[PDB]
Write a protein that binds this DNA or RNA. Structure first.
Ligand SMILES: [Mg+2]
Ligand SMILES: [Mg+2]
Ligand SMILES: [Mg+2]
Ligand SMILES: [Mg+2]
Ligand SMILES: [Mg+2]
Ligand SMILES: [Mg+2]
Ligand SMILES: [Mg+2]
Ligand SMILES: [Mg+2]
Ligand SMILES: [Mg+2]
Ligand SMILES: [Mg+2]
Ligand SMILES: [Mg+2]
Ligand SMILES: [Mg+2]
Ligand SMILES: [Mg+2]
Ligand SMILES: [Mg+2]
Ligand SMILES: [Mg+2]
Ligand SMILES: [Mg+2]
Ligand SMILES: [Zn+2]
Lengths: 99, 98, 239, 66, 83, 90, 101
RNA sequence: CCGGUCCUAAGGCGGGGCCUAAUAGGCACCCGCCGAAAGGGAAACGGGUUAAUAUUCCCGUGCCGCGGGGGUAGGUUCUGC
RNA sequence: CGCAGGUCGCAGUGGCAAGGGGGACCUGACUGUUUAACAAAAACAUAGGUCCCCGCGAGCCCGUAAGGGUGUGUACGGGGGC
């Protein structure tokens, strides 16, 4: 399931140190952290750059926004997003509510 | 009305201008009949199209999807922020105006 | 000699202080912001627990606020009683509708913001009591308090949540974090010392201590300090 | 030190020199106008150098061989 | 001046002289070029290498010159014309 | 071409009646051709040098710059000597 | 079409950026000829790329290929002469990298 | 024209004020200053010379800052191309 | 970097330079730290676990006082134990 390892994935940089449980928590987080996400602005499936924990940048449209420490959007953060970015859903609802 | 099916008809039968830069040129220099803008267009692009289409007297329909979804609705493998309908060949894409 | 570590901290030696010159400035509300502003930057600040937003108001006043999750560079925010309760806006607490998640909550107007400032935290607006200019809010700890209804809060949750769920896998990683903070790193257990250096230091089989009363003097007041209870039974009674 | 390629431009400095130094080669001649600020050098064909040298002397500019 | 040459603040440049010796010349590094107040990118027309302060740099012939890039100026003018 | 910026400035300065600047730009044009062509010959990039010399011969005709012809002849003489040595070594 | 003969424009790039002018002629799909009279606004008469001018909602009635004094007489007919002397002022402090990506 | 000298860093000192039985003791506040011969930071290179100095003397060729004279572009209601 | 052939020595990484290896138990997870001058360890630390004091005019600590540290901080936080 990984490029050269079966389960350790990104935590392979730790070798046999720190314990299975610790390296497993790291792998669970970093698979999402270093994977591809959707830009909140341009909706492109791109690998966003984390400038620092909580700061994310889109290399396609230049959108720089505040997010989670390790993922661009936390579970609770998703429900209280700015509505200048939920323009697709406002138009989708209206289109269903008009035709 | 299915927007996507009618857009593909307008592209293949009539004349459709695809892309923000070419749409702006059509508004400023040509006489488009309808301009379609994706819902997640950047603020600078939306205001530019809104301003130019107003001075040109051309209606704007905001597509209910992203620029990625507008491209798929036009059967294109790329994003489409905005497109201008100059000739509705055999579709009624102008039904989106009202 | 004999003064224990907690007593030496109060002297404010260099190893106990915060290297606050590493930061651009305090993250607090200025007293007289109003109108619309623009998010011009979002920055990492050493030693802080959340990303920081630099906001420029129309009259050119700039201030630092903790960035709401989802806030983006170039976003237009609104400050004041007329501001809609959208994420990133700064509103008086008496104007915020009930059930709204807010952060950087002032306790009194003009204190700059006191509660729910760490990454991922938020406060809930529980009620309004306007006949005495008070708003009821729930703090991240679960405590319910009253605040000045004229005080300011920001709409949303603090960005940077989830930081503590990832382990500090190595000692070295926490070491670098500590250097941006005020913590003395690392810590020595009391029972690892000799009696002159800690109440727990000493015996052939070293042991911890039973709790001390709240009236205990400094140098005695270590370990459990007037604790209501300890262990799993205390958690059960807490619930 | 500065180099000038056009004779017409060089003569503006050559006429004002404290001394003009001449260094001869087989195919070209270096003329160096020593002014208070700068040494201005031009490479010219040998035939041109003789004509330029004559004009500088007629304007009473000191000419020396180096 | 010797510990000052052990730091890497100055470039170590090795040069041969007309006398046949190879010496080290300690030279200054270039100053950073002017950057756009909005994007932080170097401004066109002014990104030449400069090794000391006090040298006049010519800004491009445009309103707001060497303060913002042409892209920032054009967009800001478009906003103001409408508004 | 490499030294086209100087050709335009000469026309611009002359059309404005700036005789002093036209002379200075004329000097800069020759510097651009000779200095660049000389460097190419010294580095034995004879092909790059020859294209510069060809263009240099045209602008010398266009602007009537005698000194440009004299320096082009010198560089061409050096080029043939380099080519002579190569062919003999080959 | 918006960029047409008589449409008042503001140049956005070049040395003449921020100065008002008037479209007097159309060359092709990329270029129009603008001459917002030099003595009035400071824009000299030459072609311009349509991407380097921002149209204004003000439009005047003139003929194709109109000259400088014909433009001048039309501006005073519409009373826009003092409008054609004001130079547009950008608000640089409201620009963020998002707008100029 | 090599360094100091200048700048500020972590920090420090003095006056005022507040504290003190009191001070030569303390310092959150106001004002000023100090704080780097490895940080920031104007401007010099080659050759020769002495028993012993050498980017310092001598020769040559320059650079920086400040000030002035002449010429020029430009200006002289208004703006350089 | 490879192939074919010839050939010498006791010895061809010829000097120089340059791991002995394996099985098992106890013990501390690991890297790290320590009795400057008899102890380097199984001691200390550690990441991780858990409990306590605390909503900030707090909790804990320093100062005779003026005042101070934590704190340019705010429970995903500060302090205190194991
Ligand atoms: Mg520390
Ligand atoms: Mg012991
Ligand atoms: Mg004791
Ligand atoms: Mg006791
Ligand atoms: Mg004991
Ligand atoms: Mg230095
Ligand atoms: Mg430096
Ligand atoms: Mg000093
Ligand atoms: Mg000596
Ligand atoms: Mg050996
Ligand atoms: Mg160990
Ligand atoms: Mg020992
Ligand atoms: Mg030992
Ligand atoms: Mg231990
Ligand atoms: Mg365990
Ligand atoms: Mg116990
Ligand atoms: Zn994006």
């Amino acid at each position: 399931p990984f490029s050269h390892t079966k389960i350790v994935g990104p935590a392979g940089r730790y070798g046999a140190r720190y314990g299975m449980g610790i390296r497993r928590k790291v792998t669970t987080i970093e698979v999402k952290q270093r994977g591809k996400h959707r830009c909140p602005s341009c909706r492109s499936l791109v690998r966003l750059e984390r400038l620092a924990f909580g700061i994310w940048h889109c290399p396609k449209c230049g959108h720089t926004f505040a997010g989670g420490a390790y993922v661009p959007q936390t579970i609770l953060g998703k429900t209280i997003a700015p509505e200048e970015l939920k323009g697709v859903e406002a138009e989708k609802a209206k289109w269903k509510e008009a035709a | 009305i299915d927007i996507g099916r009618e857009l593909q008809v307008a592209i293949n039968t009539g004349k459709v201008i695809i892309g923000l830069r070419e749409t702006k040129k059509s508004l400023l220099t040509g006489a488009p009949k309808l301009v379609i803008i994706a819902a997640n267009a950047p603020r600078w692009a939306r205001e530019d199209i809104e301003y130019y289409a107003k001075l040109a007297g051309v209606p704007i329909f905001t597509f209910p999807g992203s620029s990625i979804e507008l491209g798929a609705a036009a059967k294109r493998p790329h994003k489409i922020m905005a497109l201008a309908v100059v000739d509705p060949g055999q579709s009624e894409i102008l039904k989106l105006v009202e | 000699g004999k003064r224990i570590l907690v007593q030496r901290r109060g002297r404010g030696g260099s190893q106990f202080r915060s290297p606050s010159w590493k930061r651009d400035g305090p993250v607090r509300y200025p007293p007289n912001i109003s109108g619309r502003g623009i998010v011009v930057e979002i920055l990492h600040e050493p030693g802080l627990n959340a990303p920081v937003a630099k906001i420029r108001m129309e009259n050119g006043v700039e201030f630092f606020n903790y960035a709401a999750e989802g806030l983006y560079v170039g976003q237009v925010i609104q400050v004041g009683p007329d501001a809609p309760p959208a994420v990133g806006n700064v509103l008086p607490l008496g104007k915020i509708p009930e059930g709204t998640m807010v952060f950087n909550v002032e306790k009194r107007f003009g204190d700059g913001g006191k509660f729910a400032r760490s990454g991922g935290t938020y406060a809930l607006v529980i009620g309004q009591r306007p006949e005495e200019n008070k708003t009821i809010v729930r703090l991240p700890s679960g405590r319910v308090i009253e605040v000045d209804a004229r005080g300011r809060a920001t709409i949303g949750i603090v960005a940077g949540g989830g930081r503590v769920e990832k382990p500090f896998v190595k000692a070295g990683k926490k070491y670098h974090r500590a250097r941006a903070k005020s913590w003395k790193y690392p810590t020595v257990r009391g029972k690892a010392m000799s009696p002159y250096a800690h109440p727990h230091g000493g015996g052939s089989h070293q042991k911890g201590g039973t709790p001390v009363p709240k009236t205990a003097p400094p140098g005695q007041k270590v370990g459990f300090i007037g604790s209501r209870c300890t262990g799993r039974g205390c958690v059960r009674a807490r619930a | 030190p500065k180099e000038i390629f056009l004779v017409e431009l060089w003569k503006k400095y050559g006429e004002k020199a404290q001394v003009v130094r001449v260094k001869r080669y087989e195919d070209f001649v270096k003329l160096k106008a020593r002014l208070s600020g700068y040494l201005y050098t031009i490479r010219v064909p040998p035939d041109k150098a003789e004509q330029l040298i004559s004009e500088l002397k007629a304007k009473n500019v000191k000419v020396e061989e180096v | 001046p010797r510990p000052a040459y052990r730091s890497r603040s100055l470039r170590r440049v090795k040069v041969k002289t007309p006398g046949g010796r190879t010496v080290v010349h300690y030279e200054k590094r270039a100053k950073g070029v002017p950057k756009c107040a909005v994007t932080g990118q170097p401004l066109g027309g002014m990104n030449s290498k400069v090794y000391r302060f006090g040298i006049s740099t010519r800004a491009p012939s445009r309103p707001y010159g060497g303060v913002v890039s042409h892209k920032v100026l054009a967009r800001a003018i478009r906003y103001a014309v409408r508004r | 071409p490499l030294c086209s910026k100087w050709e335009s400035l000469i026309t611009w300065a002359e059309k404005g009646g700036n005789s002093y600047k036209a002379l200075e730009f004329r000097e800069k044009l020759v510097e651009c051709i000779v200095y660049t062509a000389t460097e190419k010959v010294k580095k034995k990039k004879l092909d790059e040098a020859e294209e510069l010399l060809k263009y240099g011969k045209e602008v010398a005709k266009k602007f009537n710059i005698e000194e440009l012809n004299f320096h082009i002849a010198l560089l061409e003489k050096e080029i043939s000597k380099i080519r002579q040595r190569r062919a003999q070594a080959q | 079409k918006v960029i047409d003969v008589g449409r008042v424009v503001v140049k956005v790039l070049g040395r003449e950026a921020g100065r008002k002018a008037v479209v007097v002629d159309i060359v092709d799909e990329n270029y129009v000829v603008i001459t917002g009279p030099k003595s009035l606004s400071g824009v000299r008469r030459r072609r311009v790329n349509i991407n380097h001018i921002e149209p204004t909602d003000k439009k005047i009635e003139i003929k194709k290929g109109a000259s400088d004094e014909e433009v001048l007489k039309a501006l005073e007919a519409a009373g826009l002469v003092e409008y054609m002397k004001e130079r547009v002022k950008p608000k640089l402090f409201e620009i963020t990298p998002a707008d100029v990506k």
